[PDB]
Design an enzyme around this catalytic site. Structure first.
Site, PDB file in Angstrom:
ATOM      1  CG  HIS A 140     110.745  54.716 120.624  1.00  0.00           C
ATOM      2  ND1 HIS A 140     111.044  54.499 119.297  1.00  0.00           N
ATOM      3  CD2 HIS A 140     109.450  55.111 120.661  1.00  0.00           C
ATOM      4  CE1 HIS A 140     109.973  54.749 118.562  1.00  0.00           C
ATOM      5  NE2 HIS A 140     108.994  55.122 119.362  1.00  0.00           N
TER       6      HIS A 140
ATOM      7  CB  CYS B 202     106.621  52.975 119.501  1.00  0.00           C
ATOM      8  SG  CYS B 202     105.904  54.615 119.330  1.00  0.00           S
TER       9      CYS B 202
ATOM     10  CD  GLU C 193     113.872  52.542 119.671  1.00  0.00           C
ATOM     11  OE1 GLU C 193     113.087  53.031 118.834  1.00  0.00           O
ATOM     12  OE2 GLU C 193     114.334  53.194 120.623  1.00  0.00           O
TER      13      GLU C 193
END
Ligand SMILES: [Mn+2]
Ligand SMILES: [Mn+2]
Ligand SMILES: [Mn+2]
Ligand SMILES: [Mn+2]
Ligand SMILES: [Mn+2]
Ligand SMILES: [Mn+2]
Ligand SMILES: [Mn+2]
Ligand SMILES: [Mn+2]
Lengths: 222, 223, 223, 224, 224, 224, 222, 221
Positions: C198, C95, C200
């Site tokens: 994102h 990001c 994660e």
């Protein structure tokens, strides 16, 4: 023009303004500056606020003590001293009356739960502008000139004067014996210390307004 | 013994003045007629930020995008500005303050950023208040120039701007969008500096910002 | 012993790297001059999400629709990538991170979604952060294609985009609106993958996303 | 190159270390087996505040006065101090930090203020964090004595305290309370100072507080 | 042994069905495969309101003004209507529900009221949710006409709308702006009614609204 | 004794009436049919602020920018003014109140400030409610003019305006943008004053505002 | 097909069932008379946590330390347990559940942790609800002992406890508190396991906790 | 027309009166001297819930546990009940309302639940306010007995109680607590029923509770 009243750090400034005085707010500043602060004014008004630093009256903080800000206490003690030095009038409110007490060797109860005898409610839930508990007033007091015996006054505190400082006398107490008003005894200046908050009642209580008028008048005499 | 600086009715303003050696006094809002006595109590006047100025004061009705205002504050501060200029005592104005001075002497304001003819830059920063966010071009001949270099980065917390500059004033700094960020007097009876940003929030980190307050106090000592 | 992955300062990023066999350490923002030492400590570098990039870093003043930004972070992460590239260590940016790498090497970005010429799709999704929301087209010959199939559903939590791509970089993924979602290196000393989404937040339930971190660790494993 | 200080997992801590010339890195929570690798990265170890330490770790079930606690953190920090002690690297523990080290070496804690035999003073102050609240008595011979004068005012943000002092340690500070405010090691394999208060919140306004962190860093570059 | 009504997902919905004589059950989100097993447990299906429908389900990337959506929820509800249809069991769709059915059989939706080519009326009422806000014109020959008179005030709490109506369906009610407020079925294997409003919020004080739920139950013990 | 004033429904309105010599009673919302019984026990009617009037009442469906409305209040109040008019008792309407009167007798309203053909001034003031914000031009021959000077600053807390003024009324006050701030009747069986602003929030600190309520009470007294 | 597990209501419970192979169904609160029809729709019954049980159900009036309760939930779940025992269908209760079962069959509860004669440990943990806080002692010949090792760490989320155990039941687990954490059926018409804790919040991270739901599912298909 | 019921102050009480055939009007707080004009406007009086009654009115100073109070409301309501009795108009008092008429005629109050001799039951229920929470014992010969059966579950939202009962009254209901939950008049000039709970929150889902309101308007008729 009008006598200048130093208010220590809104309803307080409205009170002074309505009674003919010109209020200025003294920010917290270094103790050594107190003399200059007091020279700017004709009278001093000590305001409400937070508990007083406990080390100031030789006590460590108990679990029941609330927040306290040392710089404020230090500065105001210096203002009280400098004010007494110049003999200018002093009107103290709530913590203010307790600050004057700590300033001259007195002590405080850190919390209402520490009083030996069961105390009444001194943290009213009733609209702050109205009186909650009844006080008995010393007939020969300065208070006595403005308030009748058995008057009801508001209450917004959890601390109280324990050992009264030398050179003062109690002029008002609630039915539980707690000190609600203190006056000077052989003091260089006129002094009225009230435990309640008359700046919240004066808009609707003529007698409360008179306490402020008293300060301004005394400031005029100087 | 320290010069007295009246701070218009907050903490970061008294800190700045104390850090620079002045004795701050906070002036509460009072009747316009008490302004003379108020100024007689101080050697300098510091005007602080706050709500938008009452539009009627610059002869305008409130537009839909104007914010909150309080006539009593504006009235009193205009009175202070005047008693100050009469006394020749120094004035430092910040944000709303620079705008109030401008209104006090006949100038106008843009009621909101959406009303500027051109799409202006962000002036209500979302960045940490203490950090600068938009660069300002500065007139090398000005008083400000003595404390900040050209292309200085300053913060911004406002949505209104000076529209018509009042007479006897010079614009001293602008942002890339040409918006007035600093104003100084011209032939005025007293020293004056007005910045649109908030130096009181930067002086702890920016020594140059401290110089502005130090300048106010040094000028004030002159009495 | 595992390879040390430096995570730029968030718990989900440390989870991802731990789950993939690496030992993560969090690098607080620090003065640019310490970037050299910071990198010496790691085998791989991970740029995480966060606030918008200070505009002056790619020569632009703050527009009205720019969110909050913090100069010391960008300033430090810029010094970090330069020290990583210089040491040939792998860089995985997410990001905000992909955007920072672009600005670090001379690139530009759109300050807000409102500023894009053509109407863009949603990039600040309201769907659960763990679920993919917009479909991306992937370049068959890229690093991304090795772990992600074309037309993959990816998540989105941003309002700024890469404007002009920096030199030595190639765009590897785009959403149906043409917006850049993935950037890869071309003739640079380090293995570089920058994704606009994102991962994660998806890895604990999207094995493909987990492979992006596995890639970073393996690539770091080259020590 | 500056000495690297591993900060166990806030900003004020990194601010303190950087202000003193160290290069901080935050060691996130990981599996105990990685503590060795972790410490192999730093020259000094800094334990921070946070949640109450898991009761079972000092052989006690949770009393209904205990706050939150996250076992995975305690385990990691335990291994962390062990690898630091074994590596001979300096350690500075703050608030929760000083309590973890105590537990990591056999010590015990009071699960809450209400549980102390005699009414204690306030230890969860309402005075803003930056300011000191209660007075502490310091051992003139202590390491703490080198940077803090006796009767120094110190802040307090805690509701638990050390009970039984782990062996090979000695208390270096207490409040009029009798409550333990500072612990130093007794012939440990590494320099050690654990304080019950929060000096990261005080150093920006308290020169003496900055010195504790300076000590860690000077002590960190001493080794290495 | 009353009619078993499966309610997708809602307390007001269970209240509506219970007052009408049915035995409600709440079907959690499950894998679309379990849909048949689910519908086998019931005699009637009630689709309730909720988030917007995933845009890809009707071949569209997410628009900037699209709200939140939950794929798993949509996936399961679609497999739920198909299974309900195969079994010829009655279906009553509310708000989001009427829209899901449409998307299930190949129709589309407006992703947001701002996307409608003509200025729409307010469909996200700020009026008490229990009262009606906009008036609807009803097809006098429709199922709805048997329970609601023409021009009745109905509530509204949606920001999306049916764009292109899927085949095998007909429009039964619209607001003055032309937006679709009711969908009926053509040659569908089962009774069907989909309203864009929230009758479960009105039945407590609107007899007419209780009638619609009565219809679903009557239709359910009309297949058992 | 004192004139009874039926207040439609807050506190500051009753404060106003009490300060001026009237005995107020709050009329809760009730069925229209009880309106004549309601007016029978009061000598004057005071209509208060509140929500937007249901659009249906003036033949319009709800726009996207209309606010919340509550039909039962509007119906009851409509019934109240008619019963009050039939009794010739004085009526004082404030904010919403003045708009409810206009609607009751056949007028219309702009549903939102965004709908007025020309840019309007701010009418939802941010300045605190107690102080005036926009200046109004007063009809010198008007009842209003007996209490307010021309160019008087008045407060504003509304987003709707009178569009088409009902017949048998005349506008007596406007803001520089032309919007209607005050309406009075002519040949009406009742004394009537309608103001768009909120005098109840200013009377404590604006003598002229108090006169408005005084007039209502004086007038309701003349009918005894 | 898959066993239909009925879950009593006011999501992690759903997760537990689905992962273990059952097909969960949410049973909204309804009239007690409908419990027979409700149970007839399922192969297994899962009682979930929630509010304290209304005191009158075990012949007590509400004490000042009791929390909120909703009589309809209770009455319906009591009918639910009775219909389950009738049909011999398996029952797995959690937190509130284990308490309801005990009340439905004549037992009683402690309205609050403060009402226990022995100062109990903490049973309303501040720790991550997904982790265990207090260690329980498990009976070796327990249905529970077949899925959890002794001295296991388990979570809590309650302030009420079973006081008097009901007929046909044996206490299966206890915290060092003495407080009961698990109850099993004794000569009951159906398989029964009741745990005071919340395994539904641990199962995603504690395989052994998953077993408890597996047991209910297996026992249910039989 | 319908019987006028003056409601002191609340939407649920209005609903209650309307549901039962009365025409309610809210009497705002006014000066005591205006009470007689207020009652002259109504056929019945309904005292509502609210804050604790000020301490001094029953000759007591405020304890650390009393809640908030507002003297003007107490002063006006007391003048109101005095006016209602002089006119012989019926009175239905709810919650604090029951305690206000008690202090109005010489009674006394417990300032807080913690001050009762025994450990009282919960009187500030956390259960949904529309439902009953504690069972009350009712006098078989009570006017209350004509609407509620003995062992009736009733709601509770108070932290204060009647202490010394005023003269010309009788307790008609108690919780297993001993605490007074209902009071009726003894040879009073007007019909009277005082209840400690909140029937206006239950009548929606409890026909008997509605009977208490119907009884007020029927007497006012
Ligand atoms: Mn007091
Ligand atoms: Mn600016
Ligand atoms: Mn995107
Ligand atoms: Mn401490
Ligand atoms: Mn609609
Ligand atoms: Mn207006
Ligand atoms: Mn437990
Ligand atoms: Mn009760």
């Amino acid at each position: 023009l009008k006598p200048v009243i130093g208010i220590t750090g809104q309803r307080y400034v409205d009170a002074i303004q309505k009674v003919g005085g010109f209020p200025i707010a003294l920010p917290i500043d270094d103790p050594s500056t107190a003399v200059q602060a007091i020279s700017l004014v004709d009278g001093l008004l000590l305001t409400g606020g937070q508990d007083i630093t406990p080390q100031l009256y030789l006590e460590e903080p108990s679990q029941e003590i609330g927040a306290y800000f040392p710089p404020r206490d230090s500065y105001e003690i210096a203002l009280v001293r400098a004010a007494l030095d110049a003999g200018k009038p002093i009107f103290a409110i709530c913590r203010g009356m307790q600050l004057v007490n700590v300033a001259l060797g007195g002590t405080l109860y850190q919390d209402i739960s520490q009083v030996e005898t069961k105390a009444l409610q001194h943290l009213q839930r009733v609209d702050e502008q109205l009186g909650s508990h009844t006080i008995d007033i010393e007939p020969t007091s300065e208070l006595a000139k403005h308030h009748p015996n058995k008057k009801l006054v508001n209450s917004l505190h959890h601390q109280f004067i324990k050992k009264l400082a030398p050179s003062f006398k109690v002029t008002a107490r609630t039915a539980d014996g707690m000190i609600e008003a203190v006056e000077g005894d052989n003091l260089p200046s006129w002094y009225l210390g009230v435990q309640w908050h008359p700046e919240l009642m004066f808009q609707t209580d003529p007698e409360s307004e008179q306490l402020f008028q008293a300060l301004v008048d005394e400031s005029k005499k100087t």
